[PDB]
Amino acid sequence: ARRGALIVLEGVDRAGKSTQSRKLVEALCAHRAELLRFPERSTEIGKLLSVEDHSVHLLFSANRWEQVPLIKEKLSQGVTLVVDRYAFSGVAFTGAKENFSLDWCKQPDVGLPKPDLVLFLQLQLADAAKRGAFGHERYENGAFQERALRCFHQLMKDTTLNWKMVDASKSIEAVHEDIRVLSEDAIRTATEKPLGELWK
């Protein structure tokens, strides 16, 4: 009764997370795999996120926590979950707003299902800035993006998490190939041990 893997895709805005997450799920299914995106706008907590920045940070964490019974059930059924943004983006975005410390930002997400694999989609900030995605002012805020990346860097220092850096500057097919190999390795190997808990 082999459990599914919990795979998280992280990285700055326009790194290719939505593109690569959908590509991964569909390729795995062509294995039992499902896609999860944070924030999940469909729930009641998600509908509130559609000001007070601490409330917003907590609402983003409560949106992750409300999906925990679903996460655990799917994983126990043998379904691998591909997650487009998790607690790491939560800490990075609030940390990019800068008013609050990394320690305060991490705390609400402490205890969440620990990912078996955290894919960090790395690319130069100037490389992501020249990408075909618009619709958010924060994309053009260079300073915000630099602070968000600094937050991601500090979070990668945690030796307990299975962080795997992927060169996100490469072609759609080459980035997919790297993500596919690492994800398949996680489904076969990382699933041997029971599902852990984030930052504890």
Ligand X SMILES: Nc1ncnc2c1ncn2[C@@H]1O[C@H](COP(=O)(O)OP(=O)(O)O)[C@@H](O)[C@H]1O
Ordered DSSP codes for 107-171: GGGTTSBPPSEEEEEE--HHHHHTSS--S-GGGT-HHHHHHHHHHHHHHTT-TTS-EEEEETTS-
Establish whether 18 is an annotated binding residue.
Answer: yes
Identify the residue among 47, 136, 153, 188 touching ligand TAE (CB under 6 A): 136
Burial class (CB in 10 A: 0-12, 13-18, 19+), 140: exposed
Other CB atoms closer than 10 Å to residue 31's CB: what's the count?
15
If one asks whether residue 132 binds ligand X (CB under 6 A), the answer comes out as yes
* Contact pattern from residue 90 through residue 129 relative to ligand TAE, giving x for each residue in contact according to CB under 6 A and a dash for the rest: x--x------------------------------------
Establish whether 170 is an annotated binding residue.
Answer: yes
39 binds, among a copy of itself, ligand TAE, Mg ion, none (CB under 5 to 8 A by kind): ligand TAE
Distance CA(127)–CA(101), nearest Å, equals: 28
Residue nearer to ligand TAE on the CB measure, 16 or 90: 90
61 binds, among Mg ion, ligand X, a copy of itself, none (CB under 5 to 8 A by kind): a copy of itself
Establish whether 32 is an annotated binding residue.
Answer: no
The CA–CA distances, whole Å, from 22 to 2, 27, 37, 104, 180 equal 23, 9, 10, 32, 12
Size of the site for ligand X (CB under 6 A): 14
Known binding-site positions for ATP: 14-19, 85, 170, 180
Point out which residues bind ligand X (CB under 6 A): 11, 13-19, 131-133, 171-172, 175
